[PDB]
Curated annotation (Swiss-Prot), chain B:
Belongs to the RNA polymerase beta' chain family. DNA-dependent RNA polymerase catalyzes the transcription of DNA into RNA using the four ribonucleoside triphosphates as substrates. Largest and catalytic component of RNA polymerase II which synthesizes mRNA precursors and many functional non-coding RNAs. Forms the polymerase active center together with the second largest subunit. Pol II is the central component of the basal RNA polymerase II transcription machinery. During a transcription cycle, Pol II, general transcription factors and the Mediator complex assemble as the preinitiation complex (PIC) at the promoter. It comes from the Eukaryota. There is a cross-link at K24 (Glycyl lysine isopeptide (Lys-Gly) (interchain with G-Cter in ubiquitin)). The C-terminal domain (CTD) serves as a platform for assembly of factors that regulate transcription initiation, elongation, termination and mRNA processing. Transmembrane segments: none annotated. Component of the RNA polymerase II (Pol II) complex consisting of 12 subunits. Interacts with DEF1; the interaction is direct and serves to bridge RPB1 to the Elongin complex in a DNA-damaged dependent manner. Interacts with the Elongin subunit ELA1. Interacts with the Elongin subunit ELC1. Interacts with ASK10. Interacts with ESS1. Interacts with RTT103. Interacts with SHE2. It is found in: Nucleus. Residues 139-151 are annotated as: Bridging helix. The gene is RPO21. This is DNA-directed RNA polymerase II subunit RPB1.
Swiss-Prot record, chain C:
SMART domains: RPOL9, ZnF_C2C2. It is found in: Nucleus, Nucleolus. A zinc finger (TFIIS-type) spans 71-111. CDD domains: Zn-ribbon_RPB9 (cd10508). This is DNA-directed RNA polymerase II subunit RPB9. Component of the RNA polymerase II (Pol II) complex consisting of 12 subunits. The keyword Phosphoprotein applies.
Swiss-Prot record, chain D:
S-II binds to RNA-polymerase II in the absence of transcription. This is Transcription elongation factor S-II. Zn(2+) binds at C143, C146, C171, C174. Residues 20-136 form the TFIIS central domain. Transmembrane segments: none annotated. The gene is DST1. The chain holds residues 129 to 309 of 309 of the full protein. Disulfide bonds: none annotated. Keywords: DNA-binding, Metal-binding, Nucleus, Phosphoprotein, Transcription, Transcription regulation, Zinc, Zinc-finger. GO terms for cellular component: nucleus. It is found in: Nucleus. GO terms for biological process: maintenance of transcriptional fidelity during transcription elongation by RNA polymerase II; positive regulation of RNA polymerase II transcription preinitiation complex assembly; positive regulation of transcription elongation by RNA polymerase II; regulation of mRNA 3'-end processing; regulation of transcription by RNA polymerase II; transcription antitermination; transcription by RNA polymerase III; transcription elongation by RNA polymerase I. It comes from Saccharomyces cerevisiae (strain ATCC 204508 / S288c) (Baker's yeast).
Curated annotation (Swiss-Prot), chain E:
It is found in: Nucleus. This is DNA-directed RNA polymerases I, II, and III subunit RPABC1. Gene3D superfamilies: RNA polymerase, Rpb5, N-terminal domain (3.40.1340.10), RPB5-like RNA polymerase subunit (3.90.940.20). InterPro entries: Arch_Rpo5/euc_Rpb5 (IPR014381), RNA_pol_Rpb5_N (IPR005571), RNA_pol_Rpb5_N_sf (IPR036710), RNA_pol_subH/Rpb5_C (IPR000783), RNA_pol_subH/Rpb5_CS (IPR020608), RPB5-like_sf (IPR035913).
Length: 335, 168, 116, 181, 215
């Protein structure tokens, strides 16, 4: 049966090349499938071309778009560099007053709204400013409140950067990010203001995470058609909202409240193997192989694919079909 | 027969008019980008869909015209050789030549062939064959058809070897 | 919009410096003794995303390019009906398909998008 | 003649002997009376009412951070020069102190900023959608699963040129797929 | 009441419920009502006046059912204890080990928040025949066994293992194998040389039973 299964699987693989590029007819669907996808499945590659992750929401929130968008905001990775239309490095020699009328209005707001400790620390504010003209649309897209998210986490992280910030009602969202340093700094250090502050400003934009989970570049809304038993007993079509990402981090997405943690799936079976087990990895691998074979319309009986999958995952782990997987086995030397 | 030719040409003309109207709408910044997909992609998608539906409808008209004593129709009905696509191409119209899933891209700078003008997006300039194998192909659509065929030739010639390795 | 300033002595760009006892900004050349008084607290600027309207690019003698199309639209200034038209010559991915017209006689630039 | 304020109007601000409350009352009274012609007594009564509401809805000794945040929100709304009408209303009493206690930041904005906010929200909700792969509609092929002829197609020269084109038909009603060659 | 307080409280309650489910699945005796304890009662009991979660009062001892004792005569009582410190020190680990040893418990569950010092985990295998197992808090929020792709596993006794091995006429090195670090193996607490049965659905026969050995 082994050679029968191998011949059955690999005969349609020869003809699969022709119709692999039908998905090439959709430019916005640049997802690996066909010969390269089968190659990557067989090699058990640890770096897929296009990893992905599909999240199904809770039964209550499935039919409404609003909770879905809240979850989508709560999953996607948000960083400061993405939310500043002008995070401009400016000279801020005397933060007490400025020439620009727009920031002048914001000046007196906090200058009458700062505590005594801030009054003492007035001199700590850098002779340069991260002057943040922040885009309204990007800030409101992630449901990001100006004050709490802008300052709580940022000052909590290292007590490194203080801010004079306005309420969202101003026509131009201007934040003044002024880093905080002790006055005990050395004279040679204190002379090189620009040298410290450009570096810390870059480390500030790049390395501060306002909200979200790492490695997930995009999250996107989609509508699908489930089939459910109606109360009278027959099967009816029912729509639902799901979230498809671009990038996989399954250990942290799984615990986010507001989703269904028992119907999550990804096309990277190594992660499923690491998180859920080896039988789960076997099922996911079977789904991947069946999908790549059947996306061309060809039909291959279940026993052949079941045998290949069982062989590939019988040693307790994923054994690739290469020399590293089979030629390092315990079989005979001449074999 | 002649009347079937008349409806064929009329369908082709109406598809061309729809494409021209979408182009006019997009050139005035009035067109709306589709869901999660750029404006240029939206324009290209509309054009491709219109042209494909035109070809299919013309093919179905030409197929419905045919009598029962037609030999090609008899072979197709029996199930031995051919399909309605072959009838459509030999009789109605060939259609839209593509390369790598997209229309014929700009090989030169801002055009596709020295006989056109810069920034041309009309269907006949981007690889659309409105003729048939019975009528005859004009040189430009002949060239685009040649590229379309070359793609599949390459496909076979190499993926033979790759599939062989996988099979072994 | 920060502008580079060159020293009047050796054409080198001027570096900023502070004056603590008067609390004023100056530009000094690290090679010579030239010092000049700063006129604004704006010395450097770092924008992130460019909200630039698309530009037709070089326009000089564009009417002699014979591979450029034509149109019969009427000039808004000199009332001429012959002109050249082309798409935006900046090659960003997301640029819209908004035309640009250069008049044949008065060399006036306009667009097909008449947004008020 | 002179900018009306606590010092100019000669109104004592130390009634509850609390430093933070004293200074916040002084600041809000000054900013309210600076540009208002309304008599100062009712202004002081309104200030007392709003500060009492602030204290009763949130203790400063336990929620000083939230107290400061709420004070900053209200104070910034008051100083906001884009919408002066609000300093009329609080002077007129049109806006109740409880409403200011409970209201969010958005509603205190003027009408144009409100409208811009809903427009931005709608645009974002539209921009969070995925690519819809709408396929060509036709009514010739019969599906094998639900037998609804609303089956989309796609045809191409993919098989070896020794053989004719290959078509793939997908039912848009049930999800069935098949191939013809 | 900052949002982080109730967020952490909810995640901790989730982890507590998951740990109770795991202890029930290991063959012990846990009521269904105790598993389905609503978060209001949890807040009422295991929170102070300031809402701080009092983890130290959550430690509890569980005993096996009649059925588990009948199937596994060697099975004994278990103890579970939480740690309040962000990082577990050497002294805390030593105190927990001494407490387990003086209680004469065969196994224990030690749930830590963020990290454990290497010197602390130096003492893990030093108390035979007792077994000490650690579970990071961030990995117990969601129950793994409740997924759709995870079939149902069962543990086999010595007699059942011998009967299967005889009936199929096999040597234990020819069965399919399952690792130790496999998440379901940690969930069930399988040691070296134990056989786990799997029940699965199948397009061809409906139900199918497989077997694996822990290596």
């Amino acid at each position: 049966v082994g050679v029968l299964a191998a011949q059955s699987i690999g005969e349609p693989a020869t003809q699969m090349t022709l119709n692999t590029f039908h998905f090439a007819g959709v430019a916005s669907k640049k997802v690996t499938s066909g010969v390269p996808r089968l190659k990557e499945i067989l090699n058990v590659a640890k770096n897929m071309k296009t990893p992905s992750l599909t999240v199904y929401l809770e039964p209550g929130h499935a039919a409404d778009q609003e909770q879905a968008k809240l979850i989508r905001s709560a999953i996607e990775h948000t960083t400061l560099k993405s939310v500043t239309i002008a995070s401009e490095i400016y000279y801020d020699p005397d933060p007490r007053s400025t020439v620009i009328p727009e920031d002048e209005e914001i000046i007196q707001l906090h200058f009458s709204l700062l505590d005594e400790e801030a009054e003492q620390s007035f001199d700590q504010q850098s002779p340069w400013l991260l002057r943040l003209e922040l885009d309204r649309a990007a800030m409101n897209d992630k449901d990001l409140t100006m004050g709490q998210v802008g300052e709580r986490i940022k000052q909590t992280f290292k007590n490194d950067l203080f801010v004079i910030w306005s309420e969202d009602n101003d026509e131009k969202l201007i934040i003044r990010c002024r880093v905080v340093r002790p006055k005990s700094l050395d004279a040679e250090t204190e002379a090189e203001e620009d040298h410290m502050l450009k570096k810390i400003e870059n480390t500030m934009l790049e390395n501060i995470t306002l909200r979200g989970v790492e490695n997930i570049e995009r999250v996107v809304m989609m509508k699908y058609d489930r089939k459910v038993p109606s109360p009278t007993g027959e099967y009816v079509k029912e729509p639902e909202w799901v979230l498809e990402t671009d990038g996989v981090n399954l250990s942290e997405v799984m615990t986010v409240p507001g989703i269904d943690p028992t119907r999550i799936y990804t096309n990277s079976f190594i992660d499923i193997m690491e998180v859920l087990g080896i039988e789960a990895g076997r099922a996911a691998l079977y789904k991947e192989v069946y999908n790549v074979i059947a996306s061309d319309g060809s039909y291959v009986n279940y026993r052949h694919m079941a045998l290949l999958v069982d062989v590939m995952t019988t040693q307790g782990g994923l054994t690739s079909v290469t020399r590293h997987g089979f030629n390092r086995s315990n079989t005979g030397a001449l074999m | 027969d002649g009347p079937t030719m008349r409806e064929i040409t009329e369908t082709i003309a109406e598809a061309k008019k729809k494409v021209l109207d979408v182009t006019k709408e997009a050139q005035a910044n009035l067109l709306t980008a589709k869901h999660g997909m750029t404006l240029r992609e939206s324009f290209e998608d509309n054009v491709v869909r219109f042209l494909n539906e035109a070809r299919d409808k013309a093919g179905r008209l030409a197929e419905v015209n045919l009598k029962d004593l037609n030999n090609v129709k008899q072979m197709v009905m029996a199930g031995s050789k051919g399909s309605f696509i072959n009838i459509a191409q030999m009789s109605a119209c060939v259609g839209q030549q593509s390369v790598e899933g997209k229309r014929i891209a700009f090989g030169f700078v801002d055009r596709t062939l020295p006989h056109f003008s810069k920034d041309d997006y009309s269907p006949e300039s981007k690889g659309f064959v409105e003729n048939s194998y019975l009528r005859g192909l004009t040189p430009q659509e002949f060239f685009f058809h040649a590229m379309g065929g070359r793609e599949g030739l390459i496909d076979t010639a190499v993926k033979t070897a790759e599939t062989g390795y996988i099979q072994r | 919009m920060t502008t580079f300033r060159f020293c009047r002595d050796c054409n080198n760009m001027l570096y900023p410096r502070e004056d603590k006892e008067n609390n004023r900004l100056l530009f000094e050349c690290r090679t010579c003794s030239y010092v000049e008084e700063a006129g604004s607290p704006l010395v450097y600027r770092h924008e992130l995303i460019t909200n630039i309207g698309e530009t037709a690019g070089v326009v000089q003698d564009i009417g002699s390019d014979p591979t450029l199309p034509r149109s019969d639209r009427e000039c808004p200034k000199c009332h001429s009906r012959e002109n050249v038209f082309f798409q935006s010559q900046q090659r960003r991915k997301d640029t819209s398909m908004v035309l640009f017209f250069v008049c044949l006689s008065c060399s006036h630039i306009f667009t097909s998008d008449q947004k008020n | 003649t002179k900018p009306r304020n606590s010092k100019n109007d000669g109104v004592d601000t130390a009634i509850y002997h609390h430093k933070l409350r004293d200074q916040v009352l002084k600041a809000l009274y000054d900013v309210l009376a600076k540009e208002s012609e309304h008599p100062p007594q009712s202004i002081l009564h309104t200030a007392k009412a709003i500060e009492s509401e602030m204290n009763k809805v949130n203790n400063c000794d336990t929620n000083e951070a939230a107290y400061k945040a709420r004070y900053r929100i209200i104070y910034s709304n008051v100083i906001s020069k884009n919408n002066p009408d609000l300093k009329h209303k609080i002077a007129n009493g049109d806006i109740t102190p409880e409403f200011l206690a409970t209201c969010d930041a958005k509603d205190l904005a003027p009408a144009p900023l409100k409208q811009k906010i809903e427009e931005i929200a709608k645009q974002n909700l539209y921009n969070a959608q995925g690519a819809t792969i709408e396929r060509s509609v036709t009514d010739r092929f019969t599906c094998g699963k639900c037998k609804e002829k609303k089956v989309s197609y796609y045809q191409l020269q993919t098989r070896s040129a020794d053989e004719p084109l290959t078509t793939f038909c997908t039912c848009e009603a049930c999800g069935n797929r098949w191939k013809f060659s | 009441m900052d949002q982080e307080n109730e967020r952490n409280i909810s995640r901790l309650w989730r982890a507590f419920r998951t740990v109770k489910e795991m202890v029930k699945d290991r063959g012990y005796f846990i009521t269904q009502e105790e598993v389905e304890l609503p978060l209001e009662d949890f807040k009422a009991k295991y929170c102070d006046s300031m809402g701080r979660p009092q983890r130290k009062m959550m430690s509890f001892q569980a005993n096996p059912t009649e059925e588990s004792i009948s199937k596994f005569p060697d099975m004994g009582s278990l103890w579970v204890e939480f740690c309040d410190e962000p990082s577990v020190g050497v002294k805390t680990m030593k105190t927990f080990v001494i407490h387990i040893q003086e209680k004469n418990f065969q196994t224990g569950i030690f749930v830590y928040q963020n990290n454990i010092t290497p010197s602390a985990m130096k003492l893990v295998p030093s108390i035979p025949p007792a077994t000490i197992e650690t579970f990071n808090e961030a990995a117990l929020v969601v129950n793994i066994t409740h997924h759709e792709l995870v079939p149902k596993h069962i543990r086999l006794s010595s007699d059942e293992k011998r009967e299967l091995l005889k009936r199929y006429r096999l040597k234990e090195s020819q069965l399919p194998r399952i690792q130790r670090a496999d998440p379901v193996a940690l969930y069930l607490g399988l040691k070296r040389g134990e056989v786990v049965k799997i029940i699965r659905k199948s397009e061809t026969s409906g139900r199918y039973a497989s077997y694996r050995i822990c290596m």
